[model samples]
Target: NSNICEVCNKWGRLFCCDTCPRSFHEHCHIPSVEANKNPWSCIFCRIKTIQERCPESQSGHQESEVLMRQMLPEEQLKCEFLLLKVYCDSKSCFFASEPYYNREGSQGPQKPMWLNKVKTSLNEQMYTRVEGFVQDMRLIFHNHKEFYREDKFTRLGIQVQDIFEKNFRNIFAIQETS
Candidate 1:
């Protein structure tokens, strides 16, 4: 029978770990409250699990499985839209930093016929194949990065990577209720 809290040894509402023999008072547990979803593990068990999953030297940097799961459909779509926007916004900066390609006497890069063709086709379809679109944008972004040797263009590339990582990881971290 669950009795006194394991850590504070006080009497109150207690939570027990499913994977290990341990229990704690709601008020005395670390974090003061468990933020984990159902089937939660006590702090001690979580630590032990992490250690078992990683090399002793790399355990500190590994994130808990509780933090990795598929995002809700709506949230995943929102993240993808934001990613596409960032890719589009980088185009202006792209041409500005590489003026030589901006038609010899023009102030901006010549809008390539192929890009216009692809954009028109997608627009006509009312925006389908978002995953494919993002992949194409990534390829174009990488090619631009290689074509330019200046800091101005490289800075844009770095920002794109940073934004993608932050948003993607956040979406990836949504936990499964099961």
Candidate 2:
């Protein structure tokens, strides 16, 4: 049902996802036009493929884990709530969009890290740790600054990040522990 590319938000050439509704431009995807192949999935769906299906009990690494292994129902709702809050307010199309890219996409740092992809991936249990959620959120804004530094757009990213942090602390009941 999506009428435009999730990252580029244009009606031009697109690489449609077989596993989800998102459509991205060939160059706007994480690794470029591999999506053009048959039965392809988007980045979000690709991440879902590797999600920690094993129970936390079977994994010894959960010893250091906190708040990441299957959170409370309240926390889960709060996580999505926070994601919703960001989309409802803050950030112009500028803060949400990238400016520079190679015609075939950067083999190095080229990423399909927009809010739209993040939002969908998040809800799909595409993450193993809750920390990665905030990490991706932080990177989304941080990249906005590096992608376009010293400007009002960066300010918008900072503003939303600040809001996200505050809300995250309150909702998750973090006490400066992390």
Candidate 3:
């Protein structure tokens, strides 16, 4: 049986998840799944599974030691979550009619190219430069509450803070006390 689209709450060509009861309008799904894939889990379910698999308790240096041992599979899953987070964050800024590339058959909600460009450009920068860029983002959300709503900015900040605390603390030499 079909239900309202999780993303748009509309009726349309719905894709039912094999692993879950969720149904999504074809265009409403993030990173739309393919029929060839056959089995798919909705975004909420996927994130829940990922969060359970990588709980905050195992996020320190010792955790990295375990992560390194199981690097390949876990890293792949983590990367997917990171990409999904980016996609979700960028969705608010995406303008479908503004002339951008859309994957074949996908409409209205293609991945934003500016984010891809930013990712590539940031990856090319030195680590300090990347930190500087993050600081720039922080300052904007800090200094310009009128331009950026306080609630939304704070929510986004919390997300970034969690990723930094759990994933990048060792990489950036951030002390647990800090």
Candidate 4:
């Protein structure tokens, strides 16, 4: 049996994914884990499911780019769901906490951005445009790659980036140019 909760790295009666070698505490997964069936897939595995069935939009890239002064109710809820999905990643442990995760290297000690901060921003309605929320969501992955570079975190960050990007387009029904 796997010894640690893949997300928190803590021990518990963890639920193992049927698709991946990951385990999670019943309360630690993206949505509610208790509702999941026995043959369950974790967040990473679900990305391919989204990519395979992403919905098509009639509007091309430009119309989808229009800015909104306020998010529609559907838009706001989707944004919240997107943040939860980001937090569900196994590698999310690295970015979920803070006084700030301190790092020193050639690039200098850059400031850290965590999901909790993004959640707070959403709560306070800081994102008026859809892309603003999307930008900060991607920034976490971009910086995750920067922080770990060649480590497992970088790889997982890239994986989650795919998940986020695919979900963003699908949820908004935004068609890709390429």
Candidate 5:
């Protein structure tokens, strides 16, 4: 006579390798017997098996390196965090009753027209200007690394510093105050 699934009391051939033969259904074996010849490690042992596959253990990079790669270069310069907000300070900001655009059924990210338009305009103009400013400072620093002209380099350094500090202050200002 075959054994029953301890969970639902349905007839099955399998007995748990970890628990006593009463606890598991034969077909419910995770790495089933047909898939593997060895009698399986059971429910209690399976918990440790799943835990071994967790991202914290599997990923090659240290947690700090992953976090460092996420911050904007400007943020890295300031050695601080950057908080980006979707809502504009202007009255023209898109007011959606259901602001969350769920992409559960969709293949790609949802591109609302207003959001795309704003992103395109900002990227084309304002973002380019800031990027160019940073680029110029980088060029100066690279070119003057050997020469010791403190005055000229100091001015460029100050501009780079100001850009980082201003961006940080702007993000901090928008944070919700308690």
Candidate 6:
């Protein structure tokens, strides 16, 4: 069965790995200049090697996966999750600190992107001091009831649902449900 390589976008080649079906340019395979019968690997596979050898490259890949890391004291109340990350939506800070985020439009007031909207919504839902509140509720509520508590996780999950719903609605604005 012939398919386009997700990497190379070729008509006849398959992907080097199952998880990623991207095709590669004929010359992009390992030993890129070769066109022999030996098995060919995609550029993405080669990138693993590049990343392994290059600490900077590896760190770049790991950067996105790193959500949070901080020391916690024995008595300090911690959230149910192991990490915390607060993405601030302070408009003045954004304009002053991150010029790239607001340079496209007018200076002070601007519309938010869908991604920024989702992130802000999730940040509002997630970043908070609700450990004590959750513990209090847990003492008074059952497992099912506690799951619906107004903590960061619960609120974030609900807000994520809203984001998904809004995105789906926008995507299939006129398509029939059936």
- Each model's RMSD to truth, in Å? 17.0, 11.5, 10.8, 7.3, 22.3, 18.5
What Cα-based lDDT does every candidate model obtain? 0.46, 0.58, 0.44, 0.66, 0.35, 0.31
Where's the lowest-lDDT run of ten residues in candidate 4?
55-64
Error of 5 at 74 (Å): 36
Give one digit per residue, the lDDT tens place, for model 5 in 72-153. Answer: 4332322211201222122212221113433343332232223233233333443333333233323333333323244454
lDDT of 1 by residue, 35-149 (tens): 6778887655654454466544232222243123233333234333334334334433342232334423324223322233333334344344344434444554455555454
lDDT against true structure, model 5:
0.35
CA deviation > 4 Å runs, candidate 5? 1-3, 18-22, 34-39, 49-178
The candidate 2 region of ten consecutive residues with least summed lDDT is: 54-63
Candidate 2 lDDT at 130 equals 71
Return the top candidate by TM-score: 4
RMSD of 6: 18.5
Clashing residue pairs in candidate 1, if any?
Answer: none
Candidate 4: tens digits of C-alpha lDDT, residues 42-119: 655664455455534334445346335257644566676677666656656666765244555525226556777777
Q: What 10-residue stretch in candidate 3 is worst by lDDT?
A: 90-99
Candidate 4 off by > 4 Å: 1-69, 99-104, 108-111, 176-178
Pitting candidate 3 against candidate 4, the one with the higher lDDT is 4
Q: In model 5, what lDDT does residue 120 have?
A: 34
Ranking by lDDT: 4, 2, 1, 3, 5, 6
Q: Over 4 Å off in model 3, which ranges?
A: 55-178
lDDT of residue 16 for candidate 2: 82
How many Å off is the CA of 173 in candidate 6? 39
